[PDB]
């Protein structure tokens, strides 16, 4: 599309500038253009892709939650009828959010996942696929909701299976995947016990492997372990 005439390296350079300027929509457009060049992404480039889209969809999700809360209050007994505007605007934001999720899922399907053979890349992309189906599930209310939830579960499960076989328990991708799959269990799949078990087992297995790490790797892993601990403290 619009980035077809820009060099791959220039798109990557501009994505990094956009990150510095907090221009995450631009960042995502640059990284989409880079993916569409058709070459595999390096570790750093995968991170740039993830940062960009997580910030874009994060703003949409936060706005959707604000609007959904207002709409819920409007449907409480004793609330005045204000017309269709709250629903319409929540739907507008929802449709834009779904479009971003579909865009990311489309990049993963055409053709990031099929070309990713190393564990670090394949797990990363499958985690992303689970995440963006999970964001679709956050807003789903209709007849495809069960299939959206199962698509998130299936992507997370394949990422877990690979990560357990091919990565150490302290690997940051393995840890971030487990954190997100645990959130999926807690708040999407109505399985809080599974969420707690996964977070606890992930934390404890990482703790036992910290002794193998350099100081810098220890810092990377313990940062994510603290997020698991934060959730365990909230949930128990």
């Amino acid at each position: 599309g619009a980035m077809g005439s820009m060099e791959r390296a220039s798109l990557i350079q501009k994505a990094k500038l956009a990150e510095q300027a907090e221009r995450y929509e631009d960042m995502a457009a640059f990284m989409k253009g880079a993916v569409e060049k058709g070459e595999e992404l390096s570790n750093e480039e995968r991170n740039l892709l993830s940062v960009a889209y997580k910030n874009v969809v994060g703003g949409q999700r936060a706005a959707w939650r604000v609007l959904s809360s207002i709409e819920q209050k409007s449907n409480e007994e004793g609330s005045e009828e204000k017309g269709p505007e709250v629903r319409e605007y929540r739907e507008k934001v929802e449709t834009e959010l779904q479009g971003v999720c579909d865009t990311v899922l489309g990049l993963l399907d055409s053709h990031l996942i099929k070309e990713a053979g190393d564990a670090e890349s394949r797990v990363f992309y499958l985690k992303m696929k689970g995440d963006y189906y999970r964001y679709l599930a956050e807003v789903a209310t209709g007849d495809d909701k069960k299939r959206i939830i199962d698509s998130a579960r299936s992507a997370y499960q394949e990422a877990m299976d690979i990560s357990k076989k091919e990565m150490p328990p302290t690997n940051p991708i393995r840890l971030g995947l487990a954190l997100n799959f645990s959130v999926f269990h807690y708040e999407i799949a109505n399985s809080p016990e599974e969420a707690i078990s996964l977070a606890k087992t992930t934390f404890d297995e990482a703790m036992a492997d910290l002794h193998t790490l350099s100081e810098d790797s220890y810092k990377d892993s313990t940062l994510i372990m603290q997020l698991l601990r934060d959730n365990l403290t909230l949930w128990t």
Partner: peptide
């Protein structure tokens, strides 16, 4: 307190 995901 909102639960953490990987950000």
């Amino acid at each position: 307190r909102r639960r953490k995901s990987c950000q």
